[PDB]
Design a protein around this ligand. Structure first.
Ligand SMILES: NC(=O)C1=CN([C@@H]2O[C@H](COP(=O)(O)OP(=O)(O)OC[C@H]3O[C@@H](n4cnc5c(N)ncnc54)[C@H](O)[C@@H]3O)[C@@H](O)[C@H]2O)C=CC1
Ligand SMILES: NC(=O)C1=CN([C@@H]2O[C@H](COP(=O)(O)OP(=O)(O)OC[C@H]3O[C@@H](n4cnc5c(N)ncnc54)[C@H](O)[C@@H]3O)[C@@H](O)[C@H]2O)C=CC1
Ligand SMILES: O=CNC1CCCCC1
Ligand SMILES: O=CNC1CCCCC1
Ligand SMILES: [Zn+2]
Ligand SMILES: [Zn+2]
Ligand SMILES: [Zn+2]
Ligand SMILES: [Zn+2]
Lengths: 374, 374
């Protein structure tokens, strides 16, 4: 019926920085070879989507943002083999081509087909499937989930269990997997360790979940918003600290609290100052610090390399280090088998048409994840 | 009989920065409880000792420098159990107390009794065993090997094989173990990998030996002094590049040479700029960069944390990550078993009285290791 035809549908178009999204009709072209058109069912509001509006995460405008989502395949282009119409799918903002040197590496996940390092805001073929007011509109990270329909490359979609609750498992497309994999796969948090988690939003709470799963003895949440502390303790924080409470820099506080520095620290905010603070607070000889937060475009940090020479390890990761297309269906299977909880991350639910209210909730500090339903 | 008595002997005293060493008579106190007085046999000239002269490595002056050495125990203080008079020994500039949280950690070696982080230039008890022209003279890293006799704490000395050649194994006290362990223990270089080594002095050549032992397929040496390239190839470099030969920054050259970035990079120089270049030239998703060189005191580097967010790992280490008192005897045993070579690091052998000439050979580019013999 709609196969092979342009679909006219509602999307949230961002015409310029620092403005509300515009909910209006777009034209969604049918999928080309090795492309998949998806009817969206639910999408989450991640701070990365806000960063696009703030201009601190740079991608070409105008754009259809959104990258944390789940839906149902509407149609497949020629040569698609890994999904079919009617399949439940999660779009992958980090693709998995399976062919590049990264995809073939045992540890690597940052596939060389990504649109994150040098964003074009297109499909793999360097064109757009979106028109609004007769003007072409950019894609975002090969996903663009703030639309009733989107088109993605095959390497940017995973088929998931037919019985999964899409209004929950959408968080596996970004914030849960990112935080959980940061702890269990990138840091490799050990049993009995002391962790510090900087930032207690959806992604930091998922890092806590991962530290708890790994058997950490102490999980210290760090946030300047003390309203975040109760939920951080519910999902495994053993104690919470607000830097604003202290006369001393928090790295010194966390060093004293952990009797010489923590085993593992995580920056889950996106500030240069807290990336350096998080490295400093891990133990100088054997500590590991993981950058998860996305820092402001084109800005450098300053740091003393003696922090590394003593023995620290500093690393970062996209999407929790997970190879996206292998990992997402397994993560959904694990959720279905009650291996981790998503409900603690979901604080608010809104129809897609109230997207701007959803972004107001995040910016106020009130929400963790708002899930938008189409 | 010198046991229990002050020894008057020859030492190389550094009275102030940027001056030659003064070869003169010093007084060496007998060892107190848990102290060891050593007759030195051979000591190497390490760039770290030159950095004390330059003022880029800060330690209290005046000082008896020297940390890369081997000698024979002359006498032991009360309570000493791990060495005896007549034993061959290597002083440990990183101690191994065996009791602190680091010494008990499987991957830590930066023992909390170290005199590196906040240098006092004393014995563990906060006093000095050296006087010269009626003035107290500081110790350096708890070793001070530019002296016919030194006194060290027991946790800063290892017993080695009675048959070892001290004019070669002195290098296990610093440069060989530092570079070799940076490759095999800290980086954990893999078989078939591509490595880049910035700086082809004694420590960088030892990194190359460790990358070769680990089965690297490609080992790219990087030095501005092309006279360093022949020896780097002898010990395992597959190609050498001089940044000065290129119009482009060398991180771009090494990324192209390695078809998208190296597996492992090592900074073995001590410059902030080359620390950032070495991080940048490792593959952005799964690369590992190790800081070995000592940067200039109190200077910060500037870097874009997106280099880490993509998946890089950045770490540093002291003494190749080896727990010093456990590892040094085993390394000497391995040298005796022909598991690695030290002769390729030794370009010059001078009597101790020619220490200044040795330092001039290093500064001029002409030497790798000069060994001074007492
Ligand atoms: N590496 C990756 O693959 C991913 C990265 N990100 C990034 O992770 C970060 C966190 O994302 P969300 O959890 O959605 O954001 P969020 O805004 O809900 O959470 C961040 C938290 O940081 C706290 N915070 C702000 N300034 C702080 C300070 N100076 N000190 C201590 N706490 C402070 C806030 O109060 C807030 O609770 C953002 O930068 C986001 O762009 C998100 C997902 C994927
Ligand atoms: N982490 C640790 O435990 C240890 C650190 N050190 C440090 O390791 C470094 C190397 O020590 P050595 O091998 O004894 O020094 P070295 O001076 O013999 O070798 C340094 C090499 O770097 C090259 N170089 C200088 N500027 C360069 C540039 N801009 N680009 C490329 N090459 C450049 C020189 O030409 C030279 O061959 C020093 O900073 C020293 O203090 C040494 C031993 C222990
Ligand atoms: O939140 C999802 N993706 C982020 C990942 C980090 C780089 C910017 C985009
Ligand atoms: O070369 C020997 N030791 C160095 C180790 C790093 C700090 C300066 C001292
Ligand atoms: Zn996200
Ligand atoms: Zn790929
Ligand atoms: Zn110790
Ligand atoms: Zn040295």
């Amino acid at each position: 019926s709609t196969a092979g035809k342009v679909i006219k549908c509602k999307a949230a178009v961002l015409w310029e920085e620092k403005k509300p999204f515009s909910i209006e009709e777009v034209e969604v072209a049918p999928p080309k070879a090795h492309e998949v058109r998806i009817k969206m069912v639910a999408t989450g509001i991640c701070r990365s989507d806000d960063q696009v509006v703030s201009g601190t995460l740079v991608t070409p405008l105008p754009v259809i943002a959104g990258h944390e989502a789940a839906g149902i395949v509407e149609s497949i282009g020629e040569g698609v083999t890994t999904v079919r119409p009617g399949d439940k799918v999660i779009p992958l903002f980090t693709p998995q081509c399976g062919k590049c040197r990264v995809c073939k590496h045992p540890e690597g996940n940052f596939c060389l087909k990504n649109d994150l390092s040098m964003p074009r805001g297109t499909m793999q073929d360097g064109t757009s499937r979106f028109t609004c007011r007769g003007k072409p509109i950019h894609h975002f990270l090969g996903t663009s989930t703030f639309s009733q329909y989107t088109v993605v490359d095959e390497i940017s979609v995973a088929k998931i269990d037919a019985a999964s609750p899409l209004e929950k498992v959408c968080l596996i497309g970004c914030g849960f997997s990112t935080g959980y994999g940061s702890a269990v796969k990138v840091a490799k948090v050990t049993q009995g360790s002391t962790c510090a988690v900087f930032g207690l939003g959806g992604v930091g709470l998922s890092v806590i979940m991962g530290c708890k799963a790994a058997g950490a003895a102490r999980i210290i949440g760090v946030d300047i918003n003390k309203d975040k502390f109760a939920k951080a303790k519910e999902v495994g924080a053993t104690e919470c600290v607000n830097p604003q409470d202290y006369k001393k820099p928090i790295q010194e506080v966390l060093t004293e609290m952990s009797n010489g520095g923590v085993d593992f620290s995580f920056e889950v905010i996106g500030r240069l100052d807290t990336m350096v603070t998080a490295l400093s607070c891990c133990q100088e000889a054997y500590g590991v610090s993981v950058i998860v937060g996305v820092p402001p475009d084109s800005q450098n940090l300053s740091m003393n390399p003696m922090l590394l020479l003593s023995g620290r390890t500093w690393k970062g990761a996209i999407f929790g280090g997970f190879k996206s297309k292998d990992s997402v269906p397994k993560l959904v299977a694990d959720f279905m088998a009650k291996k981790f909880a998503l409900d603690p991350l979901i604080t608010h639910v809104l129809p897609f048409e109230k997207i701007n209210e959803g972004f107001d909730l995040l910016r106020s500090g009130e929400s963790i994840r708002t899930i938008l339903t189409f």
